[PDB]
Amino acid sequence: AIIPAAELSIKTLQNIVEGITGVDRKIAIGFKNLTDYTLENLGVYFNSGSSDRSIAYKINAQEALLFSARKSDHTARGTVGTFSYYIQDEDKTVHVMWSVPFDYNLYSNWWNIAVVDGRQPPDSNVHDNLYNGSGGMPYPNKPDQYINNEQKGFHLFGSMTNNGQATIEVELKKA
User: Fold this and answer.
1) How many domains is the chain built from?
2) Is 48 one of the annotated binding-site residues?
3) What are the start and end residues of every segment in region (Trp-rich region)?
4) Which helix (H) or strand (E) holds 160?
5) N or C: which end of the chain has fewer CB within 10 A?
6) Cα–Cα distance measured from residue 139 to residue 121, given in angstroms and rounded to the nearest whole number
């Protein structure tokens, strides 16, 4: 679940997500910690679906997390959630939201990354605020776009693909 950040490739994420057979909505997320800080997982909140592997509790300096999630069998929902990492020594939390919906006639893929003050575990309120751009969260990000922004002394970069076997590649650096 943890590799050196410099070894992360889009091909690795493609392999991960394509290896989830049996459902039509799933995601692989590769998240690079390009800081010198240790990141501590505060949880994963699932709005829709689940995951078959535990998220890494610690992402150390210059490592990437590999994470995957998938929709549930027999349901008209997709894979949607938020994971969160506390930046040890900075008293801030980084949230990563993903949404790969069941119904592309109505909805599209979305993602978000936010840096907030304090130690903030993910939950339905945090997730909804990231999805809607409310409660002090930035507005979320469309797929097929390279996102670059700065928040609370950090630079955030990443992108998401557009379909039901989605990938997100995202990176945290000190600004």
Assistant:
1) 1
2) yes
3) 98-114
4) strand 154-160
5) C
6) 19
